[PDB]
Design a protein around this ligand. Structure first.
Ligand SMILES: [Pt+2]
Ligand SMILES: [Pt+2]
Length: 106
């Protein structure tokens, strides 16, 4: 239960929640895209590889999203998914619409 509660608190306390790991190019790219929207104040990045419970965290992220890979991206508890999902939403205008509805971008 403790792992699930830990992941949940990260997702609930931060509007933009990103689970990543060390030296992960698509993590870095996703985080960079999000920071380009000046989301820093409402973003939290958790490195789940530097964690004794990495497998449990990944299994729970898969239960929540369908995939165990990082990056895993949540916006106001909604599953965005991975960096490719973020790029699709960004290119098609859905990311900006998300952030507008949250008051995060004018
Ligand atoms: Pt943070
Ligand atoms: Pt691992």
């Amino acid at each position: 239960e403790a792992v699930k509660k830990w992941v949940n608190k990260i997702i609930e306390e931060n509007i933009i929640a990103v689970f990543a790991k060390t030296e992960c190019p698509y993590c870095i790219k996703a985080i960079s895209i999000l920071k380009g929207y000046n989301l820093n104040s409402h973003m939290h990045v958790e490195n789940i590889e530097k964690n004794p419970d990495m497998a449990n965290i990944q299994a729970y992220l898969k239960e929540l999203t369908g995939k165990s890979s990082v990056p895993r991206i949540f916006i106001n508890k909604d599953v965005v998914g991975g960096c490719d999902d973020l790029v699709k939403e960004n290119d098609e205008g859905k990311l900006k619409e998300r952030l507008q509805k949250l008051g995060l971008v004018n």
